[model samples]
Structure formats: C-alpha cells, structure tokens
Target chain A: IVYKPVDLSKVTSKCGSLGNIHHKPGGGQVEVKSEKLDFKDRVQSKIGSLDNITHVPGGGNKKIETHKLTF
Target chain B: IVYKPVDLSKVTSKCGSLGNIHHKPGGGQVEVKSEKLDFKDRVQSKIGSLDNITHVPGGGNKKIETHKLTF
Candidate 1:
C-alpha cells in the first residue's frame, strides 16, 4: 500500500520526531516515517532506536561527538 | 539476561541517524531500550533530553508553540 498526498503547509514539525544514533566501534539503528494527516491538533516530537554498545580502546581514541552539527 | 524475542521482519531503518533538539527554558532525561533479532541489518533513531527552563511575564502575554499535534 503506497499512495502520496502530503501538503500540510510544506511540512515543518519537530514534535513528530525520530531518534537513534551511535558513533562507531559497532552498532546502529535510526528510523523516521511520516503519515498522519488532518490538522487541528498541532504537537509533534520524534525519536526512535534500539540497543547498541561500542568499545575500542586497545590504546586510545574512541571519539563521540553526536549532533549539534558536530565538528 | 532478559528474555524476550522481538521480530516483525524487525523494524525499519532510518538510514542510521539520530539528533538532539533543544529550544526551551531547560531539560530532562529520555531513554529507551529495545531488542530485535535475526535481521540482516537495521538502523533506528531516538532522542534524549537533559535540560530545561521556563518563565512567564508579570503583565503581558505568553505564546510559544512547539509541536504539530497541539491545540
């Protein structure tokens, strides 16, 4: 089942958010899907993910700088 | 060890991505844990918080909107 009719004023709502992030060594998962039409109620936040653990320090360096436009 | 099997062809992938969002007075903690088995490879997304702050004027107005499903 796949149809398309998305025009809720050019889609800008973070209340319907999705989340999941891992910065290397060994695991991953992140999902975001949108399809909830009809607007009157207006609040959306999104985040989704599963489990992931990483470790790599036989010597050093296992850097993690997730998001905020990391540099 | 916890005992539970989760599978529905597993969950959908997010092209492997997750980001943080901060836009208010302060924050708090948001965490979730899940397990999925026997899927070649899948990625997910999720967000967690850690700060917050809020204030209202003595004699003025208050209107700050954040969310798409709010009324």
Candidate 2:
C-alpha cells in the first residue's frame, strides 16, 4: 500500500541514534528511540491453612474445636 | 478440648531458636522455626499493538493494509 501523509500523523515518532516503531490500535505508531523495563523491586508474602479437631474434654466429653497455627 | 498424642504424630515439627505452627487442611500442622520468600530476581518484558490504513498505490487506487511497529 502507498504511504500517506495522514498515516504519518497517525504515527508517533521520536528521533535518536537508534529508533523503532510501535503501533497503536486506532491509527497511530510510536517511534521509539529507546525503551526500558525495570523490575528491581523485591516483595515478601506469607500464606497458610487451617483445620478442626475432635478431642475429649476434662469433663469426660468430646467436642469439635478450631485448630490453627501460622509459621 | 484435651490434647491428644495422636495429634502430635499428625503435626510435622522443625526445631530452631524461634518456632511457630502452621496448620493444614486435613489433620496436621507444620511447626516451622523460620521461613523466607525471596524475590530478588529481575525480569524484563515488552508489549505493543497494531492498526490498518487505506493508502493509494502506484495504480492510483486505494487498498487496506496492515500497519504495525514495535518499540
């Protein structure tokens, strides 16, 4: 297809020593000279579970109780 | 509820200076002295989009074509 001036307007361009084109959904392109993605951050998380147990009480009867602990 | 010896068998224990209990769904607990989650690794990624346009060709006619670029 022949290139049109309107198509150029649709595209976004940046000038530098090295350049590349990035396109958008509508009708535009981003000319990028450079790109960078940083993932230097650190994160900590904890997770656990639970259970129930049936035990005999001092009163000589059995009952259900929630038994949980986290490490 | 009274504690049972059978419960002890159900639990998994690890000895250390500091200790905590983590319970599971069935009927067991994991006694952990220490735990750590590391997220020091870094990752890089890239993403972009696309579009199409109608342009005049050498024959003086208009045709649609795919227009894409990556930055």
Candidate 3:
C-alpha cells in the first residue's frame, strides 16, 4: 500500500460562494490574481438565469483590482 | 401595422463592454460560449458599490464561466 498526502492545509474550509462577491486575495503563494467579470455570467450562474443585460448610464467603467482578507 | 419581423440583422453594433469583459461570440448563426464572472456582481452591476467578501487563502474560487465578446 502506498500513500501520498496533498498540502491542502494551505486552504481553508471557509472558502465559500457569495452574492456579487469575488475576492481576489492578494499575495497568494499560487500567484493569485483576479479580475471583475461580466454581470451576465455572474447573474446566470448565481442568480440562476436572466433575459438580457442593459448597460445603464452613470455606471462608470468596470475595474477588477487585486484584494486580500486575512484571519 | 405590427411587423413580427426579427432577424437581428446578425447583431453587429460593436457590443461595447469592458472590465473583465465577457465575450460570448464565437461563431455564426448562433455563435459560441465562454465564461468567467462573480466579481461582486461585477462590482455591483459595474462598479456601483462594494462590501465584505472574505476568504483570503484561495482567491476567487467563485467563477461564473460564460464570457463573450464580439468585434
């Protein structure tokens, strides 16, 4: 019998999904990087489905910057 | 006179969008599929507001995965 263990200890079970939430944790050992995604995909995946997307005014340009939160 | 005519003219009006953009255009007649989303609902429907979304180790595990773009 042979056994090999994975170093998943670096990962926490707190990793869960959320609404309108996509945190791109910074300084990640895996060269972590994140960017904002289209709302259509977000809504369809999380919110089930949608009809069409209409871009309204006053909604400034979209941006996805790297971020991190620690315990 | 109500004209129920719809052909989309193949839909080519630039399809303008940005910031972690979704590009679902891959072919003709129906086109293609792509994905990548769930960035705080694209920063609250295109950067309107933001809030807490913690889980620092594995960044951006939440993916929407249906991005598209046309040129």
Candidate 4:
C-alpha cells in the first residue's frame, strides 16, 4: 500500500517506553526498556495500556518556573 | 487492574514516527508526530506497524566507533 501517519487515538494500536510519571483521577504512563548483559542475547522492554480507569479527580497540578539563557 | 510491563513481542500491540531508516526484505520504522502550536490543545506523537512485510535481505550493517568520558 502506501505510507502515512497514524492517529494518536489508534497509535496506541502500535508503542514508551520506562517513564516515571504522577497519576491522578485518570491514569499514568508506563514504560519499558530493552537490555542485555552480553551482546549475544538482548531483551527489549514493552509497554501496555490500562482498562476501565475511573475518574475520581485528585491529581494535583504543577506550575513550572524555570530560567534559561540563550546563546 | 494491576500494573506491569508488556512483552516486546506484543509491545507492538501498544507504539516512533517520521523516523528515517533503510529497509531490506522486511521493513523499516514508521513514525508520526502529534502536535498543535497552541497551548489550548497540545498533542503527542505515535508509531504504527506493517501488515505483511516480506523479508528480502540486503540491509547493510554498521560498526559505530566512538569514545567519550563518563559523566
């Protein structure tokens, strides 16, 4: 066929990763990593999705204050 | 339910995008970028898979050479 971009909604049908995040009334992100001791064998980590997440409403919000300089 | 890592074999069941790569008998990576230049509704990127890819062979290998100090 042809090559095209998939929608984020369905992209879940496709990939993260070991990511650490905060959760609230909804959900959080899960991630995995691929690794190996010897080059002979290797393992790639995988991620999954959540089901039936109930909205309870209790995840706090954050106000990021940062300072940066341009070169 | 509970939380855990999904298998890579099935990881495909979950997610890269706009990645430029080479293909052989099989296939290469396909990536997508989700976006919105506005603060109203920002989006995320996603990746997909191939239906029926044939393995043709002929993907050249690379030997990376690098040296760096530890952090």
Candidate 5:
C-alpha cells in the first residue's frame, strides 16, 4: 500500500475530548459522536469526507453532535 | 439504527499518544500506527478485529508499530 502509518498523536491531542466514533462493517460509513461540535471538522479533515452532520438531543443543557462520514 | 453514538472519550484518553489510523474506502481495512506497541491491542479491542500487525522501522531507537484491521 502506498499509504503508510504516520504519527497522528498531534492531531488528536488538539481536541479536548473525543466521543464514540462507530463504524459499520462492509459499509463505507462511520458515525461520529462528540461533545464539542467542532470536533467533527477535525475528523472530517483527517478522513477527508463527511456526508452529514446533525446534533443529537442531550439531557439538560448538554449538546451532543453526531456525524456520518463517508470516505 | 440500533447503534447510537456513545461517549468514547474515556477510551481514547487512556492512550498516551494516538497515532495515525488510516482507512481504505470501500474496503473493510484500517491501517493503524502507534509509537507504543501496546497501543495496537487497545485499537484492536476498540475496533474488534486486527488481521495483521507488523513493526515498521523508525529512526534511532524509536520503534513504530503498524496494524491492519478488518471488520
């Protein structure tokens, strides 16, 4: 493969907290969760494509964002 | 979808330094990179499958481990 694993710790460390990022096998889809809405952009930048992003209702004042990224 | 995005910050925070985790679109393959060898197991546990793991030569005494996971 032309792509080789490179250090990405620097990228992830930029975000304060990361949430569930689920993947469905056999499908080119990934579901991402984050407390910080902007985290979606970081993931999108890394993966290269984000098809849809929507906010999920969270209890009380907490806002949770969920994203579906297709690559 | 039965799977909803749950918080996963706890899992990623545990790792000292996160490395590149590359995915191939349309293929159930993920290439993971880590400075620490044990990090592979954590990723494998999170992702559910690790088909193969091999170490790549890093500069100096640094050792980089690369993993290929398929789900």
Candidate 6:
C-alpha cells in the first residue's frame, strides 16, 4: 500500500555504545588485574576456591600437618 | 536448699574452667600463609561465573586500552 511521504531527509549517527563494543575483550592476556574487582572478588580470585580453604575447628586440631612420627 | 558446700569446694578448685571452651584467634586465626593453586584455577576463580566478567572489545581505531575486565 502507498503511504504519504514523511520527513526522511535526516540521517542519524549510530548508537555511541555500538562503537564502544570494541572495548569488550574475550579471554584477555592480562595477569590478573586485581584493581578491576572489589576486595571480596579479589580475595576469592586469589584463593582459587572457597572450598579449597580449610577451616580448622580448634588450635590443636591442625589436620593438614599431622604426622605419626616425630623424632 | 540442700547443704553441700564440701562437694562444690573440691570441684571448684584447680580453676576447672573458670576457663573457656575454645574460641581464641591464636589457633585458626587464618592469616593466609602460602596459596598453592594452579594458574588456570586462580584465573577461573577470578572470572569463572562467565557472567561475572565484562568483555571490552578492541577500542576504536585508536584502540582505547581495550584490556577489558572480569567482574
């Protein structure tokens, strides 16, 4: 169907963010920029995993350093 | 109501816990001695969730430090 002509003479620039998309990177070549994240995130990042962190119940219960011999 | 100061006197001796069970920072004070983790594991922890990172694409023609970051 034919419609009346509209003001189509003006050209608009593309979204500014579209150009900024280049700012995004995949797996980076960076060596862990801790400055980018918060304190909590940084802590977790350095620790590898929270599960890997062992929580001891008491002082004398040092499980990881136990030995059946001590000369 | 019952008179038994003798029994109480015997037990109360030796400071039988005028003492604490076990809640001192001296033991499990967790001060992070040496973190023995692999490179990939640490990197993954830093940006593992996949959704946690912010991918920054290469900058414009000038390439504005498109280092990107893992949130």
Q: What is the C-alpha local distance difference test score of candidate 4? A: 0.30
Clashing pairs in 2: A10-A28, A11-A29, A12-A29
Report the CAPRI category for model 1. incorrect
CAPRI-style grade of the A/B interface in model 3? incorrect
Model 4 collision count: 15
lDDT per residue, candidate 4, B1-71, as tens digits? 22232222211211121232323312323333434333334334324432333332332334333433333
Give model 1 RMSD, 1 decimal: 30.8
Per-prediction TM-score to the true structure, in the order listed? 0.16, 0.13, 0.12, 0.13, 0.15, 0.16
**Pairwise lDDT winner, candidates 2 and 6:** 2
Angstrom error of the Cα, residue B31, model 1: value is: 2.0
Model 2 lDDT at residue B47: 27
Worst 10 residues of 6 chain A by lDDT: A61-70
The stretch of ten residues in a row with the least summed lDDT in candidate 4 chain B is: B9-18
What lDDT tens digits, residue by residue, belong to model 2 across residues A1-71? Answer: 22231222121221111222323212323343333333457533212211223332222223333433333
Q: Please, what are the lDDT tens digits per residue for candidate 1 over residues B1-71?
A: 22233222211222211455333312333445544333334434345533233232222333333322222
- What do the candidate models score in CA lDDT, each in turn? 0.33, 0.28, 0.28, 0.30, 0.35, 0.25
| DockQ-based CAPRI category assigned to the predicted complex of candidate 6 | incorrect
TM-score of 1: 0.16
Docking class of 2: incorrect
Q: Give one digit per residue, the lDDT tens place, for model 2 in B1-71.
A: 23222211222322222233323222323233324434456644222321112222211222233433222
- lDDT value, candidate 1, whole model: 0.33
In model 4, which runs have C-alpha deviations exceeding 4 angstroms? Answer: A1-28, A33-37, A42-45, A49-71, B1-47, B50-71
On residues B1-71, what C-alpha lDDT tens digit does candidate 6 reach at each position? 22221211111111111122222212221223334433432443232221222232322232122232233
Candidate 3 on B1-71: residue-level lDDT in tens?
22232222221122212233223422212222335533543343322112323333322223233333333
- Per model, the share of native interface contacts recovered reads 0.00, 0.00, 0.00, 0.00, 0.00, 0.00
lDDT of 2: 0.28
